[PDB]
């Protein structure tokens, strides 16, 4: 009964229809986000604002930078990265040496001491591999978490995000935590000259092939953005001349109820089983840490309604984090014959039919399209805000982008761009993907700082 396959697919659609957002739902999200951005920039409203709009102390144009050898660090994912970059006049910057280290779970959710102990050890090993523990290299730290800066080289951790939990770190100076751990070893000795967010590093690295780049966006494990604000609008910092980079931390949009009309059963479940429940709600709609898991929960509801896999879920389907976000990419990469969907599901202990496979594709499409559209309301907000703070009628702007979801998902990018463009009339937006953008961005900022 091919009649009874399509009826299963008609009911799957009534459920999937819940992930739709109309163009006016997006304009509403966009307005409300723009409203939170305003509140985050104001001294009077900053403390209660869910979008924090944090000053980064990376000021518009700089004066002259030093040249030579820098060491970049990158902490934010489930891996920590070290790299040596050569900066030179032309401004230009090149990746010379690189090395990535997997983070022991016990350093993610143990103590700050443990975490930065592990970080320092990696730095010690790296410098050995390349006999470098003697030149006192200037160190740039890309640290992908909300920080309140007093300066380029001094700022405190506001709260962890993305499942990080190391105790004894929130409220403390992050650069100090790094410096202490280095000194605990006898390493040693780096001049830590700059700490930046990954959005910031990505914008800075894209700037040199395109001077129009004044926005940085990350859509990886988490989702965030930064942009060049007018110093007159940054009430938290002294001075009204020139421009400064602002770290939106827009992931926390919705933490005071701003997205409530849009949250689904699946989002509440994802929020409630997370390391930070009630927090980073906008990010949990978009980021790759949460995307596959959201798809998993849709498949469980489809299984419970007798619409999928004969109404039975494998032990693998019922385990946390088992539908990887990469599987969302790989399912939507399928070229029509269902073989990629088949092997993913088969490896998950399921016995899928042709129509099971197609339904799983529809679930992935529903979840990632929503992410793409929710994300576009954020960027459009930022860019509409920037058009309105400036004098020209048409704003010509470049956006620097990194993150595995934007980069590796076969169609996120195209859905995302088209939606941004419907929401940003009178803007001409160029999107560029960064090349080793964190490390190169950190060293470039460091060269000006020292």
Ligand X SMILES: Nc1ncnc2c1ncn2[C@@H]1O[C@H](COP(=O)(O)OP(=O)(O)NP(=O)(O)O)[C@@H](O)[C@H]1O
Length of the chain: 450
| Residue 289 contacts which entry, ligand X, K ion, ligand MRK, none (Cβ below 5-8 A, type-dependent) | ligand X
400 binds Mg ion (CB under 5 A): no
Query: Which of 144, 43, 59, 53 shows the shortest CA–CA distance to 382?
Result: 53
Smallest distance from the beta carbon of 236 to K ion, in angstroms?
A: 8
Q: What is the DSSP string of 291-310?
A: HHHHHHHHHHHHHHTT-SGG
Q: Which of residues 184-203 bind ligand MRK (CB under 6 A)?
A: 203
- Provide the terminal-to-terminal Cα distance of the chain, rounded to the nearest Å: 72
Catalytic status, residue 135? no
Closer to ligand MRK by CB, 214 or 365: give it.
214
405 annotated as a binding-site residue: yes
Mode of pairing for the β-strands spanning 427-433 and 79-88: unpaired
Residues paired with residue 85 on neighbouring β-strands, in sequence order = 70, 95
Residue 438 burial by Cβ neighbours in a 10 Å radius (0-12, 13-18, 19+): buried
DSSP secondary structure letter of residue 351: -
Q: How many residues bind ligand GLC (CB under 6 A)?
A: 16
Residue whose C-alpha is closest to residue 52's, from 290, 255, 209: 255
Binding mask 123-152 for ligand X (x = CB under 6 A): ---------------------x--------
User: Which positions from 55 to 94 touch ligand MRK by CB under 6 A, shown as an x/- string?
Assistant: --xxxxxx--------------------------------
* Nearest Cα residue to 142 out of 448, 446, 440, 438: 438
Tokens (6 digits) for 49: 């604002």
Nearest partner of 233 among 245, 217, 249, judged by Cα: 245
| Residue 234 binds K ion (CB under 5 A) | yes
Number of CB atoms found within 10 A of residue 378's CB: 27
Task: Rule CB under 6 A: choose which of 56, 202, 224, 355 binds ligand GLC.
Answer: 224
> Within positions 334 to 373, which residues make up the interface with ligand X, using CB under 6 A?
none
162 is catalytic: yes
The residue ranges that bind ligand MRK (CB under 6 A) are 57-62, 152, 203-204, 207, 213-214, 228, 444-445, 448-449
The residue ranges that bind ligand X (CB under 6 A) are 76-77, 144, 162, 198, 218, 220-222, 287-289, 324-326, 329, 403-405, 408-409
Active site residues: 162, 198
The residue ranges that bind ligand GLC (CB under 6 A) are 76, 144-146, 161-162, 197-199, 218, 220, 222, 224, 249, 251, 283
Residues of each annotated binding site for ATP: 74-79, 221, 288-289, 325-329, 404-408
């Amino acid at each position: 009964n091919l009649y009874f396959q399509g009826m299963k697919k008609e009911k799957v659609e009534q459920i999937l229809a819940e992930f739709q957002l109309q163009e006016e739902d997006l304009k509403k999200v966009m307005r409300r986000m723009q409203k939170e951005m305003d509140r985050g920039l104001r001294l009077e409203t900053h403390e209660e604002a869910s979008v924090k709009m944090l000053p980064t102390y990376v000021r518009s144009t700089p004066e002259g930078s030093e040249v030579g050898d820098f060491l970049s660090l990158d902490l934010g994912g489930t891996n920590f990265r070290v790299m040596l970059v050569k900066v030179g006049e032309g401004q230009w910057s090149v990746k010379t040496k690189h090395q990535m280290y997997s983070i022991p779970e016990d350093a993610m959710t143990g103590t700050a001491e443990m975490l930065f102990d592990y970080i320092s050890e990696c730095i010690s090993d790296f410098l050995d591999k390349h006999q470098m523990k003697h030149k006192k290299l200037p160190l740039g730290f890309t640290f992908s978490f909300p920080v309140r800066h007093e300066d380029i080289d001094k700022g405190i951790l506001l709260n962890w995000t993305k499942g990080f939990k190391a105790s004894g770190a929130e409220g403390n100076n992050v650069v100090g935590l790094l410096r202490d751990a280095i000194k605990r070893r006898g390493d040693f000795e780096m001049d830590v000259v700059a700490m930046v967010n990954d959005t910031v590093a990505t914008m800075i690295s894209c700037y040199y092939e395109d001077h129009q780049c004044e926005v940085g966006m990350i859509v990886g494990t988490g989702c965030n953005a930064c942009y060049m604000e007018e110093m007159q609008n940054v009430e938290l910092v002294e001075g009204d001349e020139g421009r400064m980079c602002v770290n939106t931390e827009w992931g926390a949009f919705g933490d005071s109820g701003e997205l409530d009309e849009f949250l689904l059963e699946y989002d509440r479940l994802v929020d409630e089983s997370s390391a930070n429940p009630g927090q980073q709600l906008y990010e949990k709609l978009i980021g790759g840490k949460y995307m596959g898991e959201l798809v998993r929960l849709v498949l469980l509801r489809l299984v419970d309604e007798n619409l999928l896999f004969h109404g039975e879920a494998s032990e693998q389907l019922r385990t946390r984090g088992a539908f990887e976000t990469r599987f969302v990419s790989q399912v939507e990469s399928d070229t029509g014959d269902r073989k990629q969907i088949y092997n993913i599901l088969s490896t998950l202990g399921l016995r899928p039919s042709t129509t099971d496979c197609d339904i799983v594709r529809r679930a992935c499409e529903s979840v990632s399209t929503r992410a793409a559209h929710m994300c576009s309301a954020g960027l459009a907000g930022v860019i509409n805000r920037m058009r309105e703070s400036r004098s020209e009628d048409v704003m010509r702007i470049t956006v620097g982008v990194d993150g595995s979801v934007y980069k590796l998902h076969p169609s996120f990018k195209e859905r995302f761009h088209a939606s941004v463009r419907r929401l940003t009339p009178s803007c001409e937006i160029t999107f560029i993907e960064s090349e080793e953008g964190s490390g190169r961005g950190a060293a470039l900022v460091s060269a000006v700082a020292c």
